[PDB]
Amino acid sequence: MDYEKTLLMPKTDFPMRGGLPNKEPQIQEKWDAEDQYHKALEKNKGNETFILHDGPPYANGNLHMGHALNKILKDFIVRYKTMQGFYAPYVPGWDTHGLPIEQALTKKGVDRKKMSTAEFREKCKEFALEQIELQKKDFRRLGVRGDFNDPYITLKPEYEAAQIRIFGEMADKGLIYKGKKPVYWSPSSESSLAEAEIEYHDKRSASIYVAFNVKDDKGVVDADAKFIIWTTTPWTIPSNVAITVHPELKYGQYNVNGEKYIIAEALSDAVAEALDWDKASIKLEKEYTGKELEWVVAQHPFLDRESLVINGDHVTTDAGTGCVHTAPGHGEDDYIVGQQYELPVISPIDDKGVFTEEGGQFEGMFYDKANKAVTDLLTEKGALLKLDFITHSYPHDWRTKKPVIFRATPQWFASISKVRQDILDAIENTNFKVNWGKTRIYNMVRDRGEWVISRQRVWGVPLPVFYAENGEIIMTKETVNHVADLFAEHGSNIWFEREAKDLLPEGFTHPGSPNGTFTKETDIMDVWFDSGSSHRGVLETRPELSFPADMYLEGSDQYRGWFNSSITTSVATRGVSPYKFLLSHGFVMDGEGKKMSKSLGNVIVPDQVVKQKGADIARLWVSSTDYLADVRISDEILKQTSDDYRKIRNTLRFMLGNINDFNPDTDSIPESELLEVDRYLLNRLREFTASTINNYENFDYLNIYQEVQNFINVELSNFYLDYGKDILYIEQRDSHIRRSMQTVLYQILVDMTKLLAPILVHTAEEVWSHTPHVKEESVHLADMPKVVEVDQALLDKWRTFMNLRDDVNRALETARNEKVIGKSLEAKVTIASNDKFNASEFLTSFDALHQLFIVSQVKVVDKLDDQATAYEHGDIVIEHADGEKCERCWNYSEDLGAVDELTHLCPRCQQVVKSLV
RNA sequence: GGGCUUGUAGCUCAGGUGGUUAGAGCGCACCCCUGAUAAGGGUGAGGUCGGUGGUUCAAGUCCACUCAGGCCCAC
Ligand SMILES: C/C(=C\C(=O)OCCCCCCCCC(=O)O)C[C@@H]1OC[C@H](C[C@@H]2O[C@H]2[C@@H](C)[C@H](C)O)[C@H](O)[C@@H]1O
Ligand SMILES: [K+]
Ligand SMILES: [Mg+2]
Ligand SMILES: [Mg+2]
Ligand SMILES: [Mg+2]
Ligand SMILES: [Mg+2]
Ligand SMILES: [Mg+2]
Ligand SMILES: [Mg+2]
Ligand SMILES: [Mg+2]
Ligand SMILES: [Mg+2]
Ligand SMILES: [Mg+2]
Ligand SMILES: [Mg+2]
Ligand SMILES: [Zn+2]
Ligand SMILES: [Zn+2]
C-alpha cells in the first residue's frame, strides 16, 4: 500500500512564488478600506508620541529612487514605533510653489501674458494638485502608511498664513530688511532672469587693460606704482569700486620701466607676456605682499574722485590677470566681498540697455556700442591700454538669443548674521546618528552669507509688505498679521486679486500718503522659505502633531536645503531646533557607485521595481543598504534582493504548513516540558529577537537584513526545519514530541513575521492571513514580541554541539563521495573523545543523536583505533547503517514489521500507524 | 579650489584600544535527495583589504600623499 497517506505533510495555500505585483495592490486596497492609518493611531491613543516630520517633496515630475529610499526608511521608523505602542502620526506633505512649475505650464503652452496673474496662478495650482495625485499614487504603491488622504500642502490657506506669521515675527525681531543685489538682466525682455532662462552663446567683447595709478598716500605704503586693470566690459568701468587680493598669496613685482606696477606669482609669466612688454624681460625687485595690501587707498583716474580699496578674496588667480577691480553694480561675488565696507552702489541703466545718471556723454544710448567706441574715449589716454577683440561664451536670453548683463535690483534679505550664533547653539544641542552630520550643517550655518528671500515671480507666497508714498516700508505686526488673517481665510490669491487698501486693516492710516493711498510689494518668497516653515504650518497647526519633531529624515542635499531653512526659521522665531534628532541618508547610485544618468542607461526607477518585482522587494533592498552613505542599485543587486526574498518567503511557507493543525490555545507544550533541542531554538529566537529590536532602536536595518538571513538559512532551513521532518511528518499528530516542536515553530513563525512587518509589509500581512489563531487582524496592528533574557549556557552548549555537527557532516561528506552512503539516513555514526575534544562525555547530555544528525544510528564509544579520522570535536567513523529501510520514515531498522497491508515499518512507525486505522 | 563623505572576496555587509593562515549570508562549483519539488541537504573554491610611501618588531586598523567616486558650494 501507500505510506505517504499515513504521513503528516505540510498544508497551506500560501504560495511559494510571491506574485507581488498582483497581490500587493489587493492588500493595500484592504488596508485603506479598513482605514488602518487612523486605526493604528487610535490603537496607541494615549501613549507616548513619536513625531517624524515629512520634508515636502516637490509637486512636479516622477518619483525617483531617492523618494523611494527616503519614504521607505520613514515608514520603517513609524511602523516600528507604532508597533511599540507609540502614537506616531505620519503626515506627508507637498511643496507646490516655485519657478519649475511656472515653467512646466509655460512649456505646456499656457502663456502668462494672455490671462493675468490670478488666472495663471490658478493654472499653477491645478497643475500642482494633478502632480500630487500621481505622486501620492506611487508613494502608496510602496506600501507606505501615512495621512495620504489629508496631506499638508504649501498652497493651503492655513499653511500660507503660518508662513506669513513667520515672516512677521522675523521682521519684528529686526531680521528682515530691504537692500539690493546684482541679477541677470535682459534688456531685450526688460526683465530679470533666473539661470533657467539663460543659455550661452559666443559674443564679441572688446577686452582692454586700464592700468590705474596709486596716488593718495594712505596707499603709498609701498611706492606709487600703479595698479593695472582688465575688464571685458567697457561699461563696467564707470563703477569705481575697490580692487582685489587673495589673502596668503602675495607678490607685487615692481619691475623696471613703465611704472613698476603689480602682477603676481603664478601670474607674472602669463601676464606681461601679453602686455606686449618684454624690454629685456626686466627682472623684478621689491614685490610687496599681495594679501596684506588692504586699504591701499588708490585713486582710479578716468575721471574718478574716490580711491578703491582691497579686501580678502575667494577665487581670483588664473589666466585672468592678477588685476581684477570691482564694481558691485554689476557683479555676483563682486558684490559680496564688495559691500562689507562703505561702498556706494554703482551704475544706472533702466529695464532697457539705456542709462542716465553719472553717464557722461552717454546719457541715453545703450550698454553696447556706447562702449566699444564711445566709452573707449576714457582708456589708454592716461591708463595705458590695449583695445582687443576676443570671443568667449557669454550669458544670453534663451528666448531672444540676445545678451544678458548684471544689474543691481532691490531684493529682500533675512539676517542670518544676527541669528547665526543662535542657530549654531541649537545645532550643538541637536542629536545626530553620526557626528559628521553635526559638523556639516554647523560649518554650513557658520560660513553662510545673508539669505535672499525674494523672487520677482508670481507663483508663491507674497511678501506681506505695503508701501506708503512719501518713503515706503509698512511692515508692522498689525499689517502682517491682518494679511495672515486674510490668507488663512482666502489663501495667497487674495493678494493678487485685491488692491492695497483692501489688504490693509480697519481703514488703516499712516503718516505717509496724506491721501490714505497705499502701494503693495509684488515679490514672492523663495520656496526654501515655504518648506522651511513647515514646522509652523504643520507641526504647530495640526492637532495630531507637536512642534518639536522627534526627527527630520532626508537626503544629504538637505543640509543646505530643508534642514537649513527649517532650523534657521525655527530658531529665529522659536529659539529652538524644529527637530530633536537629525538623520540623513545618501543618494542612490548605480552598481558602480556612479550617478544614474539616462545617456548611460543605468537609471532604474521606483515604478519599475514595483511593477516588475514588487514593493516588498524595493523595501528589502532599502533595508540592505548602508544608507548613511550613498547606496547602490542595479539589476544584479536586485536579483540578489529577489533571491533573499524568495528564501525568507519559502522558509515562512514551510513553517506555516507545519503548524496548520496546531492550536496554540490547546496543544502547546509548557517550556519546562519541551525537548531540549526545542528549548534551544526557543532561545535562539529570543536572542534574535533581542538583537533585532536593538537594531530597530538604532535605525540599523542593514544589521537586520544580515541577521534575518543567517537566522533563516542556518538555524532554521539548514538545521531545525530539516531535522524536524523526521518528527513533524512521522510522529503521531498529537504526540508530545511533535507538539513540542510545533509549540516553538509557531512562536518563531508569529514573532518573526511581526519582527519583519515594518519591512516586508505585504508579505508579513499575507503570512499573518495564513496563520491560525492569531488574535488581531493585520500584523501591522499587533505589538512587537517582548524582549526576554536568553539562557546563555544552553546557547554555548548547543553552539558547541553545532560545531560538532559540522565535523560529522564533513565525515558524512567524505563517506558520501565514496558512495558508501547516499542520503545521511543510510549512515551509522560512531564517534569518540579525542585529544582535542571529550566527545564521549559531551555527547552524553543529548537525546536522539540519530535524529539530530539526520542519520539512522549514532554510537558513542569512548575510543577508536587508528582507522577513525580525527576532528576538532573527536574521532569519527562512518559506515552504512544497519538493518533495512523503513518504507515510512526512511530510517534504517533491524526490526521492520508489517501493520496490515503496510510492510517494512520500523517499531516506531508501526505504533504511529496502529494509532491511525 | 572649499566643507562633509565613500572605496574589504562575484553581490550586500562584519572586522573595539594595530598582533597567528581577514569573517558572514547570498551567489557560484561539485555532490546528495526527490515526502517543502519553478523546493530541500551537504562539501568546496573565491578577497591581502583602491594605489604608493611611511610610523612600528608588527597595520585592513595609525600618518602622509595619491586615484576613482558622492552631496553641496566656489563656478
Ligand atoms: C536621495 C535623493 C536623491 C537621489 O538619490 O537621486 C536619485 C537619482 C536621480 C534619478 C536620475 C534620473 C535621470 C536624470 C538625469 O538624466 O541625470 C534625495 C532625496 O529625495 C527625496 C526627498 C525630496 C524632497 O526635495 C526634498 C526636500 C526635503 C525639500 C522640501 O525639497 C528627500 O528629502 C531628498 O531630497
Ligand atoms: K528531496
Ligand atoms: Mg552594519
Ligand atoms: Mg542555504
Ligand atoms: Mg571592492
Ligand atoms: Mg564590494
Ligand atoms: Mg561598511
Ligand atoms: Mg559558500
Ligand atoms: Mg594590493
Ligand atoms: Mg609597510
Ligand atoms: Mg623600521
Ligand atoms: Mg583590529
Ligand atoms: Zn550660439
Ligand atoms: Zn519508520
mmCIF file of C-alpha atoms in Angstrom, chain A residues 825-828 850 856-859 879-887 889-898 904-910:
data_model
loop_
_atom_site.group_PDB
_atom_site.id
_atom_site.type_symbol
_atom_site.label_atom_id
_atom_site.label_comp_id
_atom_site.label_asym_id
_atom_site.label_seq_id
_atom_site.Cartn_x
_atom_site.Cartn_y
_atom_site.Cartn_z
ATOM 1 C CA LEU A 825 19.954 8.411 6.678
ATOM 2 C CA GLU A 826 21.860 5.442 5.228
ATOM 3 C CA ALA A 827 24.586 6.216 7.729
ATOM 4 C CA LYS A 828 25.681 4.922 11.095
ATOM 5 C CA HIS A 850 20.490 9.964 15.306
ATOM 6 C CA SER A 856 19.960 6.135 11.148
ATOM 7 C CA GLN A 857 22.174 5.415 14.148
ATOM 8 C CA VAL A 858 24.728 7.023 16.403
ATOM 9 C CA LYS A 859 27.176 5.109 18.567
ATOM 10 C CA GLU A 879 29.655 3.318 7.738
ATOM 11 C CA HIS A 880 26.381 2.303 6.100
ATOM 12 C CA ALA A 881 23.561 1.911 8.621
ATOM 13 C CA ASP A 882 22.370 -1.453 9.928
ATOM 14 C CA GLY A 883 19.088 -3.133 9.116
ATOM 15 C CA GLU A 884 16.686 -2.398 6.307
ATOM 16 C CA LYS A 885 14.970 0.746 5.115
ATOM 17 C CA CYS A 886 11.662 1.520 6.826
ATOM 18 C CA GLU A 887 9.312 2.428 3.983
ATOM 19 C CA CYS A 889 10.180 7.250 7.890
ATOM 20 C CA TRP A 890 13.083 6.076 5.708
ATOM 21 C CA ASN A 891 15.350 5.370 8.684
ATOM 22 C CA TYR A 892 17.167 2.016 8.668
ATOM 23 C CA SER A 893 15.968 -0.543 11.223
ATOM 24 C CA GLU A 894 16.900 -4.154 12.006
ATOM 25 C CA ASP A 895 13.372 -4.826 13.274
ATOM 26 C CA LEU A 896 10.996 -3.944 10.460
ATOM 27 C CA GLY A 897 7.444 -5.205 10.845
ATOM 28 C CA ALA A 898 4.141 -5.029 8.988
ATOM 29 C CA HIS A 904 8.646 -2.647 6.180
ATOM 30 C CA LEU A 905 7.692 -0.360 9.047
ATOM 31 C CA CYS A 906 10.050 0.196 11.953
ATOM 32 C CA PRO A 907 8.687 -0.270 15.508
ATOM 33 C CA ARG A 908 8.293 3.474 15.828
ATOM 34 C CA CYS A 909 6.216 3.729 12.665
ATOM 35 C CA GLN A 910 4.212 0.595 13.489
#
